[PDB]
Amino acid sequence: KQYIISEELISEGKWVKLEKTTYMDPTGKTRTWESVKRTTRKQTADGVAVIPVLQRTLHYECIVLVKQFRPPMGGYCIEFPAGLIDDGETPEAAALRELEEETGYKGDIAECSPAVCMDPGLSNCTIHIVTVTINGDDAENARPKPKPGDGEFVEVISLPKNDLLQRLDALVAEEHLTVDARVYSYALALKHAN
Amino acid sequence: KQYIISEELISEGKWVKLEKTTYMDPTGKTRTWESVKRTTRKEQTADGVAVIPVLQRTLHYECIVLVKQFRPPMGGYCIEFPAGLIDDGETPEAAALRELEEETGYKGDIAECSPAVCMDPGLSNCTIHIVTVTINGDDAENARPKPKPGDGEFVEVISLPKNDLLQRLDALVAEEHLTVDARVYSYALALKHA
Ligand SMILES: Cc1n[nH]c(C)c1-c1ccccc1N
Ligand SMILES: Cc1n[nH]c(C)c1-c1ccccc1N
Ligand SMILES: [Cl-]
Ligand SMILES: [Mg+2]
Ligand SMILES: [Mg+2]
Ligand SMILES: [Mg+2]
Ligand SMILES: [Mg+2]
């Protein structure tokens, strides 16, 4: 019933662009919407977010998270390991690559989501949420070495799965950090499931 | 270690603006970052709220109440948590309860409210409070929930069981052409993994 009529370019940067989307509402009236987009997409989605489950025997299962300075936020944020998918790359391969680059861990694919939207009121940005198990007992994951690219500066924070929300709340309280919405939504559901 | 140096405007629309952010990296080098921001924010702790509405009913499995909406940036329909911006002077809990009633028709009760969490921190400064709300479906006020949508709002309600959320979300994705929200998918994945 609703559909895109046309798109006007307001201001295109190098990486980000701002468009004025004109769309048909379900009654019949025409309405406008300043939509946001990325220029880097070719591709199933823009990027991937890795839910990395660190499994070590006789230890609590941990979720591997990344702390980075984020200039749009103007501060540090706790997030799932993540990054854009390169040209000629399946979402599963981008997940294992980004996981190793940012954390140093070599993981195995458990499952992969379809394209899911990030902030659909604001932007068109999508990701594949990729669940990855990491064998922490394997010798390749004994001394994990992050391989950061030019510009990335990532700090690894592994928190136990069984108390993820409470440990995230503790980090917000004593270090002024902004936890990611998807990380928080995941941590909430872990507690709510019971 | 890392901090904001300056923020110069590239373009400002009625609702969204694009800024050229300059920041210091941890090696001591100056770098730039195109950052997206909303013009509607002012004194609020976050831009908006996302409602995780747990519909509770005697001799019913708990349901998560979701909303289906055409989203002009995505160019199609999206399945999301009920959500909207926080009005000036409005507390996050009141915004959550109002938006839930407007989009679904349900009168909820506050369970818990998250701190400000980032929506897409590589792209924008946008934040929300994730407000968990219980809905007493046995109450007479929640018997015939009538959505009260504002100007330009056209919301359909989709209530799915909590114990089978991910599979029911996948079943909707296979049947029709629509995108599931990343926070909703993250929530459903956690319910599986717990
Ligand atoms: C979403 C949303 N919530 N509140 C407003 C004013 C918007 C908006 C409207 C058109 C284009 C971009 C926006 N960010
Ligand atoms: C995020 C991200 N992934 N890849 C690039 C080039 C960006 C980016 C960098 C600075 C400002 C805006 C952006 N979208
Ligand atoms: Cl798993
Ligand atoms: Mg990254
Ligand atoms: Mg990387
Ligand atoms: Mg809304
Ligand atoms: Mg609304």
UniProtKB/Swiss-Prot annotation, chain A:
Positions annotated to bind Mg(2+) 2: E98
PROSITE patterns listed in its UniProt record: NUDIX, NUDIX_BOX
Outcome of swapping W15A: Reduces affinity for substrate about 8-fold. Strongly reduced catalytic activity and strongly reduced affinity for substrate
Subcellular location: Nucleus
TM segment ranges: none
Record keywords: Acetylation, Hydrolase, Isopeptide bond, Magnesium, Metal-binding, Nucleus, Phosphoprotein, RNA-binding, Transferase, Ubl conjugation
Up-regulation conditions: Overexpressed in cancer patients with a poor outcome.
Name listed for the protein in its UniProt record: ADP-sugar pyrophosphatase
